[PDB]
Amino acid sequence: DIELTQSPAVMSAFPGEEVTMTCSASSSINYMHWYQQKPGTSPKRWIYDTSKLASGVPARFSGSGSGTSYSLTISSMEAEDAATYYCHQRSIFTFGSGTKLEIKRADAAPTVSIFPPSSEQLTSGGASVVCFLNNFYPKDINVKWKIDGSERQNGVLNSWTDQDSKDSTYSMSSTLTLTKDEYERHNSYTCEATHKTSTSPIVKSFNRNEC
Amino acid sequence: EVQLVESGGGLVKPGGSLKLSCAASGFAFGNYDMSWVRQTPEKRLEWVAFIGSGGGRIYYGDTMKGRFTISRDNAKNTLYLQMSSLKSEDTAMYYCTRHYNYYYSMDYWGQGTSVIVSSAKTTPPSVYPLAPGSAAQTNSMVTLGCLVKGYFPEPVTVTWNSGSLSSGVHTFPAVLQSDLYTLSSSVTVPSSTWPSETVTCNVAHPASSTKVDKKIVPRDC
Numbered sequence: 001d002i003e004l005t006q007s008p009a010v011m012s013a014f015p016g017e018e019v020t021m022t023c024s025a026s027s028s029i030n031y032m033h034w035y036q037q038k039p040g041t042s043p044k045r046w047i048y049d050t051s052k053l054a055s056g057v058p059a060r061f062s063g064s065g066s067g068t069s070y071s072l073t074i075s076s077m078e079a080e081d082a083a084t085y086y087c088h089q090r091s092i093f094t095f096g097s098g099t100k101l102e103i104k105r106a107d108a109a110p111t112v113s114i115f116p117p118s119s120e121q122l123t124s125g126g127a128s129v130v131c132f133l134n135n136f137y138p139k140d141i142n143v144k145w146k147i148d149g150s151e152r153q154n155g156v157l158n159s160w161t162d163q164d165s166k167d168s169t170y171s172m173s174s175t176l177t178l179t180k181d182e183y184e185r186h187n188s189y190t191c192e193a194t195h196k197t198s199t200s201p202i203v204k205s206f207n208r209n210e211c
Numbered sequence: 212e213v214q215l216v217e218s219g220g221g222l223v224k225p226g227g228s229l230k231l232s233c234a235a236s237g238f239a240f241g242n243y244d245m246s247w248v249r250q251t252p253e254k255r256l257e258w259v260a261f262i263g264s265g266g267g268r269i270y271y272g273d274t275m276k277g278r279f280t281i282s283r284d285n286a287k288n289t290l291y292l293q294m295s296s297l298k299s300e301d302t303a304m305y306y307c308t309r310h311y312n313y314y315y316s317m318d319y320w321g322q323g324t325s326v327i328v329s330s331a332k333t334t335p336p337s338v339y340p341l342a343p344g345s346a347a348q349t350n351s352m353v354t355l356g357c358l359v360k361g362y363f364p365e366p367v368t369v370t371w372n373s374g375s376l377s378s379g380v381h382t383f384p385a386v387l388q389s390d391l392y393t394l395s396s397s398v399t400v401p402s403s404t405w406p407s408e409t410v411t412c413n414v415a416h417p418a419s420s421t422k423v424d425k426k427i428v429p430r431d432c
């Protein structure tokens with residue numbers, strides 16, 4: 001069969017830059033289509049028949065290519081252009097895996113806060129310690145948990161938001177889930193964020209034996 | 212004008228069956244070839260089935276293996292997909308689409324209907340208030356939260372003060388934990404306003420018909 005690969009998987013750019021992404025076919029085909037998708041909504045026809053713009057698509061966009069190689073190009077990119085773009089063609093079962101275009105902005109350190117397990121959760125026999133890292137840039141950030149002075153790595157789950165549609169920052173939660181008995185065996189809980197904005201981490205902590 | 216509106220998706224045990232429908236409006240439905248496209252949890256898009264305008268020409272995607280049947284009723288402006296012997300790998304959002312010309316771009320898409328194939332059962336969430344407690348903050352702002360734990364299937368919808376606190380809110384994508392979903396939501400308000408002004412998270416889980424409010428109250432230390 002014929003299969004599609006897209007490059008790059010993820011890219012980011014400031015508004016005003018030129019953007020190019022590529023779609024490659026394992027064997028020659030023609031009349032490539034491109035679909036735009038944003039979080040929570042359906043794919044949308046964007047370019048079709050290799051180079052025709054769909055209705056509502058600005059002339060900053062163009063498609064081109066032939067044979068085994070195709071591309072979508074954006075001049076003077078705008079914030080609303082941020083999306084995942086997928087290629088597809090009439091003899092292809094699986095769409096290309098998509099290029100996710102993200103918005104570059106000024107670096108920002110996270111606002112960090114930590115929360116002890118609630119008494120209601122303890123009553124049921126679980127204990128989640130929740131740490132929020134809000135409104136930071138870029139997306140790459142490292143979170144480290146220390147329990148009574150020693151690094152802890154099991155039972156941590158992290159979840160990032162999509163890039164924020166108004167200020168282009170990212171937020172993320174880091175949650176340490178323990179049993180109530182495991183939580184009750186230790187006292188000092190620390191959440192540390194290490195981000196490229198500073199060589200020294202941002203630290204929030206609490207002692208279980210307070211409050 | 213043109214509308215494509217899917218339905219019939221839901222939770223189904225492995226080996227089970229389901230029928231999806233797509234209601235069409237605003238165009239001469241019988242002049243157009245139609246398709247089903249699905250998007251997997253990994254965001255991968257797969258062409259499932261295609262039907263010609265007359266219903267006499269049909270194609271299926273590679274991994275379907277005869278378990279899918281596309282059909283249409285041009286009199287009722289409805290497209291169908293019958294799915295049987297369902298597998299874990301059939302979990303996806305299923306989209307109704309319309310074709311433009313004979314290079315087969317898809318010029319209109321429906322809103323999608325979600326199909327989830329597993330043995331897990333519908334389960335309501337536990338909701339817990341996140342007050343600073345022994346981690347009390349000291350800025351001009353304070354951040355509070357709600358922990359939503361142990362529900363199935365997705366989604367839940369989280370609001371703060373019935374939607375009147377909308378800025379300063381981050382609701383994080385849910386993750387599987389012991390094969391049930393968990394998420395947290397944070398809200399940030401001026402520290403002069405809490406606790407003098409109440410802050411409450413509103414959690415709705417439609418699949419279980421559950422709705423709960425958790426007031427964020429300072430902990431009794």
Ligand SMILES: C[C@]12C=CC(=O)C=C1CC[C@@H]1[C@@H]2[C@@H](O)C[C@@]2(C)[C@H]1CC[C@]2(O)C(=O)CO
Binds near residue numbers: 090091
């Ligand atoms: C254009 C096409 C071929 C000729 C035709 O009269 C109508 C179509 C539309 C459906 C396309 C089909 C083939 O190309 C094979 C496809 C891609 C099928 C959709 C699934 C498909 O059966 C497949 O995925 C095979 O790999």
